[PDB]
Amino acid sequence: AVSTISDYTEKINNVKDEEVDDLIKNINKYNYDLFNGTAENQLPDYLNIHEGDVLGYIEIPSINIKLPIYYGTSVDILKKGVGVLEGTSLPVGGENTHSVLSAHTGLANQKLFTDIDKLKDGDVFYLHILKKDLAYKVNQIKVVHPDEIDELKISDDKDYVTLLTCYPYGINTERLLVRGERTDLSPSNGAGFSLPST
Numbered sequence: 001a002v003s004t005i006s007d008y009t010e011k012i013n014n015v016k017d018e019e020v021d022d023l024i025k026n027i028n029k030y031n032y033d034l035f036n037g038t039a040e041n042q043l044p045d046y047l048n049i050h051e052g053d054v055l056g057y058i059e060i061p062s063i064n065i066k067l068p069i070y071y072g073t074s075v076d077i078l079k080k081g082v083g084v085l086e087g088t089s090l091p092v093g094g095e096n097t098h099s100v101l102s103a104h105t106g107l108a109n110q111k112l113f114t115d116i117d118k119l120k121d122g123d124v125f126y127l128h129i130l131k132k133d134l135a136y137k138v139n140q141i142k143v144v145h146p147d148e149i150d151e152l153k154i155s156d157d158k159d160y161v162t163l164l165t166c167y168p169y170g171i172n173t174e175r176l177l178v179r180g181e182r183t184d185l186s187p188s189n190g191a192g193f194s195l196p197s198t
Contacts, residue, residue, distance in 0.1 A: 079106035136180025
């Protein structure tokens, strides 16, 4: 709930800023190796990110969803919030990244499935990862077979995040892929920002 998000917010703000900056720098290196095929599903030792580590949270204001984000999709973890799909980009953004956020499967896929079912093209979700803020605008809702790859792959010159949910009853179930592409945090009406000059 908001106790996990509160307990993430507390612990992360109490870490040295330079250690979070280095972790962000190492994540960006993993995502590049991943895209270049010089890394594998199992995270390198230089990250100290593990199955069940909270990276932060997702806000979907359209449907008042606020859920923590864990690394990985392990079963002791899959009944709390949202999991980063092993083999997909870590959600810190950038060109040549595609992070898949997989729904957790208990009572909060019986809400979450129908809730991300309500999302349409132009809807925005916010990631809060390791004190980094990112915005994503939905541009592809896709119902897919469970042995399907192409719609979860990193696209060249693309910064994507896919919300992956399964129909929660039965086995070999159709997965719903709500794909966001990277947008500005700033609202488009208000603008006008200049650097110092003299």
